[model samples]
Target chain A: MRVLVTGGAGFIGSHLVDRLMEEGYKVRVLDDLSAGSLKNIEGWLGNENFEFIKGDMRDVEIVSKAVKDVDAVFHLAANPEVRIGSQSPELLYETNVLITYNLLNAVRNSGVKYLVFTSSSTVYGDAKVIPTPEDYAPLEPISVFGAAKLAAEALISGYAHTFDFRALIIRLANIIGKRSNHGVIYDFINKLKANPNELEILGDGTQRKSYLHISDTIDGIMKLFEHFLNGEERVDFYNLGNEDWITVKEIAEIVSEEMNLNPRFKFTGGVDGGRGWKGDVKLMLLSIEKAKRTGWKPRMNSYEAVRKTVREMLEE
Target chain B: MRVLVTGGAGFIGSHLVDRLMEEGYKVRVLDDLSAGSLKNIEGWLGNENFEFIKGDMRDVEIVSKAVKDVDAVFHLAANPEVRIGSQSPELLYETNVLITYNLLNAVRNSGVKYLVFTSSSTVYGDAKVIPTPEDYAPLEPISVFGAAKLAAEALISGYAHTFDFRALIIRLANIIGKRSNHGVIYDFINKLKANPNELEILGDGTQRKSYLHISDTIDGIMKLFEHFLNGEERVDFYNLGNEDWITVKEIAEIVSEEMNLNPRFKFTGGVDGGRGWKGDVKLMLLSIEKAKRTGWKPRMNSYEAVRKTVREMLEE
Candidate 1:
């Protein structure tokens, strides 16, 4: 089978592309190279089954050509910066919502039978319930990025149903690993590198959330797709996250321990009740019981994922 | 307080504008006049507390200026056509989603504290629940219109929380009443007018859904708005629908009887299973128990609203 993975050069996208190529499936990647890097997918560039199309999804023409001749699409192209959502709402909307619309239109026109989107668990906002289930109600996102993801999911669901395509949306939580460009682990690593003696953490350092390693996240996607192939749902959502969660301070200690540095942790004392930023979700842990039904479970818990990611980034 | 009502000259918007004006609130209507007719708000043309700006929300400058002085916003502007979703997804996205983003930006910049959005029951596409409550999980809209509405709602929720504004979203069922220029009733009226002996129905005529009259809809909005003022919620959603529902064939019978003609119904036998068109929700009925708790209930059920709309449209 052949598939087109948008943002294929990016962290999660490249990892998935790596697995797909290794499995002997023809793979094509459409990456704008903005938040993603070409070095991540450099290994697959020489393979006959692997092709790369570097272009932004903001343009419909770019998306239309990238989707042609692909049986399925892994739509992972997005602006991953949730911290700057309030400052650049327009940019976030353009990259996330507008591009998703463009891709949806392209998918509809190209007759891609299966479309997979990597959405965020932030769509749940500051959930009143811990381990927020997939069946959680009133998805009131608190950030532009979260809202944009939810918007894209809604559009994908609508288009998939209306145009007779299958859509599988995976609402992911704090996916961290090697080749990951952004997030808390990366942020902490950079901060510690800049000043080993001091580390500035966003929020009150008490913002707790689940995390999943790239290995497990990719595994879950593959397993779920295999399960999706047998089912007949027109559009469905699955939350891919770890059962356990960690706090910002806990993650800081893990990062510092991995680097062998005892750093003085400085909290930004962030906005909206110890949040990382204006629209930060202080506490988030998605209910992964739905995805677990497909015989998939996180290889590493949140703490293990954080410590492992620190070593990977440090080695790189 | 000064309020800006987008699409104020359209079906629901015009009625809402009437109520706001009657209540002695300073009302400013920003309508592009695409789906909205100027004649709908002509009676209030000379009113001192009313001002109408002929501009589209797709343009940020237009929306920015329109929202500058308003303390509140009634974002009702949207292309109400759901049947053409397959043919004109771009139009639906632009009018419903993109324009909403523009309005949100403007509202954020201008400090519009209270935002009231008129969403739709279509957002709950082919729901499994009979009386789909406000807290219905896994909102997967089937049509582009429904998706667009949900997308807009997500954006609104995000912006409201991030910017510290209050958002009250009303998911309206199939709203019908006098001056409503679209929907099944209007189609039936026009079809019966051209050829009284033959009425063409879009589906197999088994599609059942809830409907709310414009009067009750507006009243719900006003009542809900009052309730919203007393609450501290950053964002909240309420279903403005009836307890009962009506079928297409039943509605056809009512319209034909009201028009005083016996026309042979020609069913198009639509694309999906007995739907009016692609993305049409075959079954929908929202639970108004939440709205009832706020002392706001629709006086007319689906059948009453449909029958009343037939007479009102016939008179028009």
Candidate 2:
């Protein structure tokens, strides 16, 4: 089988591309290389089964060309920055929502039977229920980025049903691992490296959320994607994450410990009631039982994922 | 308080502008006169408390200027066509999703405290549960129009929470009444006028869904807007529909009776399991219990609303 992975040079995208290539599936990587790096997919650059198109998904012509012959598309291209929402919401909308719409239009006649989108847990913005299930109600995203993700998901669902395609919507928790260059673990590692004696944490340092390693995240994606292919549902949603969760402070301690430093934690005492930033959801933990029901479970818990990510970042 | 009503010259919007003007509130209408006509709001053109700006919301400058002096915004501007998804998805995206994003950016720092958006029941695409409430799960819209509405709602929720504004999202049923230029009732009337011997219905004629008259819809909006203002929730959603539903065949009968014509009903035998169109939801009924709790209930049920709509359209 052949597939096109948008944002294929990015962190999670590259990982998925790696597995697809290893499994002997022909792969095409379409990325603008803004948030992603070419070094991540450098290994598969010259393989006969591997093709790379350096283009932006926001451009309809580029998206149309990339989706031409692919059997499936794993759409992962996005700005991936939640904090920039306050300063540059236009960027978030253009990258996340607009690009997704462009891809949907492109895929409408491309004969691509399956579309897999990596949505965010933030779509559930400040959920009143813990371990929020896939069937959670009133998805009120609190940030521009979250809203963009939800908007993309909504468009994909609509286009899929209208245009005769199957869609797989995966809402991912905080995914961290090697080759990843963003999020709290990476931020903490970079911060500690800059000043080993002090660490500035966003929020009240009590913002708790689930995390998942890249290995397990990709495994679950492939597993459930296979399960989805066997199913008859037109659209399916699954939350991919570990059962346990960790706090910002705990992640800070883990990163500091991995770096062999005892830093003085300084909280930014962020906006909207001690949130990491404006529109931050202070607490989030998704119930992955839906994905687990398909006989797939994460090998690493949140704490273990955090510790491993810290070690990997330190080694890098 | 000064309020800005986007698409204020349109059907439901004009009626809303009328109410706001009669209630002694300063009303400024921003409309491009594309889908709406100047005649709709001609009565208030020279009124002291009413102002209308002929501009499109797609342009950021126009939207920014219109929202500058408003304390609240009633966003009702949209293409309002669900069947155009396959042929003109871009139009739906720009009008619904992109325009809403523009409004969000405009309202970000404009001190617009309240945002009331008119969403649609199509967001709940082919729902498994009847009498779907506001808390319906996995809101997978089947049409580009439905997706666009949901996308707009998602953005509003995000912006409202991020920028410290309150948002009230109203998912409306099939709203039909006077001055309405679209939907089945209007289509039936026009078709019968052209050929009194036969009327062409889009679906299998058994496609059942709830309908709300424009009068009841506007009243519910005013009552719920007041309820929203007195409440403390950052964002809330309500389903504005009827308890009962009417079918296309029955609607055709109502229009025929209103027009005093013995027309033969012709069913198109729509695609996708007897739907009116490819993306049409075959059956729909929203639970109005939540709206009922707020002391607002529809005086006209679906049958009454359909009949009244036929009369109103015939008179027009």
Candidate 3:
């Protein structure tokens, strides 16, 4: 089997690439190395089955060349920051929406068999239901980042229906673990690393979110692929997220506990739970019953996911 | 007061300019006359209070030139079709979003005191709430048209906040009546005019939508401008729409009744609820509570609005 993963040098992408390589599949990685560093994939550079193309997903020529004869495409390249979206929305739209549009168009023309898309729980917007189902009505996303992801999902679904491309959208919760470079875990660890005695969090400490370890995220995607592609006649989708939801305060406590440092906390709460800088979704949790039906479960609950990621990220 | 209305030669825009001129305001109209026809505003061709500039809103130079000394701006220009959007999403994005961006930026630099933007209820997408509120979280819109409108709204809000401009976004429902060019009401009327006894309706006509008359829409916008400018706020919004949600099927019946044709209905039954084409919102009924609070209310209900609009559009 041959697989091409865009943004394969990034945190989750790097981990997924490693797993794919270990499974003995020929792997081709296309990354612009914008936020994704080459160091993340340095360990895979010499592997016989792995090849890296130092290019952008937005570049049509580069993407077309990379996608030719690939059995499946794992499109994961996108802007990393959620907060930057409000300030510079066009950049996000260009990266997340335009890039996906190009990639899907290319894949649709390339006659690829299966494509797995990494969507986010943020697509749910601020859901009233704690564990919101996949088919839930009224998916109102508040952030530009979420809008980009949801737009991509819509394009993917649309393409899947319009064209003959079989696609899968994995709506991941906050995926954290080794090589994870953003989110609450990265923020806390970096802050504590700079000054171990104090930590400054962005939210009101009441903003709750679901977290899934990177390993489990990939696991869910793989199992979903095996089940749907191997059995189903139509495009398949599954929400890859841990069942538990944790508040920011709880994550902070878990991080401090993991560090074994009694860090003093400063709370700076604002409107919309302070989590909303501008166009931010304060509360977002996904219902993983669809993934569970596929017999794919996340390895860690929300709290454990955060703690594990904090400890792993602190490693050399 | 001097006002620049983009797409002033179009259906609703022409009426808006007429009202503005009648109110003794200096009105400068900027329209490419693409979707807009010169006939719509031909009566005001030589009026001293009305100046028509044949220019594209996308051209920054032209927009800046027209808006330089204008007291306020009423932006109501774009391709207003969900079907055409599917055919060319990029054009929709460019015309709807970039044009608005350019207009707002020009207005901002000029220190324009007020702006009235024609947003759409399609921004609501398929709302679960019966009467979708202004503050409801916007999900990823299905049509390219809706996405563009939503993006424009975001840009307007951002510009208003960053600058000292007073902005009002009026999310118009399916606007029908005099010079009507789109929707089931217009389609049925035009089709019936072509063939006196037989009409082919696009969809099964199950889709319901709020229809606002041109007069009511213009009145609501003017009211909002007065309410905001007279009040202390620099930025405000109102949903400019009539009450009651009418379905496509209902619209067909109304159009037939208005024409007195008793036309034979040929139901193609639309791809998506016969909602014209794909990416159409099956239902859209905006809550006008916020607008009412702003002391701006629609005079005609949905049925009356459609009826009046059909009569005017078909005849004098």
Candidate 4:
């Protein structure tokens, strides 16, 4: 299988590239390197089939050239921040919506039959249900980031439905592990490493959410791809995450324990440190029943995912 | 008071201008005349207090210059058609979202304190209830137009909540009466005049929606402005419309009867000829309980509003 990954030099993308290469699929990456780093995939630079292009997914020429003959596209390129949109919502439109438009146009024009889009559980916002199924009503998202993701999700669905293209949207939880530059676990580890005695926690540390290991994130995507290819189903989606919902406090506890550092956490919570910043979902846990039904479940729970992330970050 | 009205030369806008002018406020309109016709406000050309400029809202220089020294802003600029976005989503983004950004920046920079934005019930999109309130759950708009409106709504609300500016939102129901270029009543009237026997209808005509006369639309906005101005509310929103919900079949029946011509109605109910288009609201009725609490209400009934609209168009 020939595969094209947008934002392929980034955290999950780089790792997914490595695995796709290992699975004997010819892999290529299209990245602008704005947020994605070359060092993330430095180890695979010498591989023969691994092609790389420093270009934007928003640029039609670049995306078209990369997706020309590829069998499928794994789109992961997005504006990485959720809070910046409150200050400049236009940024979200530029990166998230425009880039997706270009990519979809490229795929449709190039006759690429399959597309796998990376969505977020953030699209679900402060969902009341402990585990939200894919069909949850009123997907009210507070953050502009979540709104953009949801907008892209709907567009992809509409395009796929209207056209005969096969599209899969993976609404993922926080995917954390090695090479993960940002997350609660990564933040906690970085703070502890900087000052062992004082661990500064954002939000009251009481903010609860589901987290998935990066390996598990990739694994779920792999399962989805295999299923779509083998089955008669033209398009599908699966939530990529562990079912266990963990709190920031729990994540902090695990980080401190892992470091064996007597860290006194100076938490910034409530008005000063509201679990997350503006547009951050204070409470949400995505249900993975659909994914599980598809015979694709995460390898770790949210707590275990955090623990693993801490361990991996310690090495880095 | 000096007021800045965007798209003030268009349909409901011209009426709003008339109301604002009679209330003894100096009015300035910023419009490109792209869709906003000159005929809409030809009556106000001789009025010294009313000034007009031919400019797009997306142009920062034009918006900033016009908004300067203005005490408040009534933003009503938008690409009205829902299906138009499907054909050119990027164009919709430019007109709807980007223009909003430009307007907000100019308003904030010019120190304009109060801004009343005209949002739509289309933002609700196939609502769960008969009359979806201001605070409805799980809003997933099917059309690019609704998505764009929702995106702008977030920006307006976020700006109001974050900045020390008063932002009022009026989520209007199907606005009818006087200079309506679209909607079933006008379409039917015009179509019957051209070919009196065969009136083609879109959708199955089962789609039910509330209608707001242009007069009531302006009144609700006036009440909203007064309410926000009298108090120190940063963000105030109200649904302004008649409570009665009518379907397309009802609208066709009313239009046929009003015309005194028993036109052979051809029921073509797909998006192009269906009761509703892709993003058209199939069943939308907003609860005006919030408006009632604020002491603002619609005086016209649904059919009365439609009848008034038909008369206005015919009389012209």
Q: A40-137, model 1: which lDDT tens digit per residue?
A: 99999999999999898988899999889989999998898998898999999998899999999998888689999999998998888788998798
Scored by TM against the true chain B, the candidates give 0.98, 0.99, 0.94, 0.95
Ranking by DockQ: 1, 2, 4, 3
Q: State which candidate has the highest lDDT.
A: 2
Give the whole-model CA lDDT for all candidates, comma-separated: 0.91, 0.92, 0.78, 0.77
Per-residue lDDT of candidate 4, residues A75-161 (tens digit): 888876776756866687678767886786676567678889898887766666667777664455656677677767655654453
lDDT of 4: 0.77
Q: What TM-score goes with each of the models?
A: 0.99, 0.99, 0.74, 0.82
Per-model C-alpha RMSD: 1.0, 0.8, 5.5, 4.4
lDDT, candidate 3, B24-90, per-residue tens: 9999999998888889888888998889999988798999998988998999888787777656766
Candidate 3 CAPRI level: incorrect
Worst 10 residues of 3 chain B by lDDT: B135-144
Candidate 2 residue-wise lDDT at A302: 89
For model 2, the superposed segments whose C-alpha errors exceed 4 Å read none
**Per-residue CA lDDT of candidate 1, range B1-316, in tens?**
9999999999999999999999999999999998889899999998899999999787889999999888999999999899889999999999999999998998888879999999999999888987999888899999999999999999999999888888999999988998888888888888898999999999899898888888899899999999999998889999988889989999999999999998999998987777888999999889899899998877887888888888877776
Candidate 4 per-residue lDDT over residues B1-316, each given as its tens digit: 9998899988888889999999999999889998889888888887999999899987889988988989989999888777665567667767776788678767656778888888878666667776778776444555666766766665565455434577887888889988778767877888898987888888787888899888888888888788778887556667777788888888888888888988776776576335355566677899998887767788888989887788778888
lDDT tens digits by residue: candidate 2, A97-188 = 99999999999969899999999999999988889998898999999999999999999999999999999999999899989888998888
lDDT of 2 at B242: 90
lDDT of 1 at A220: 95
Deviation in angstroms for A167 in model 1?
0.7
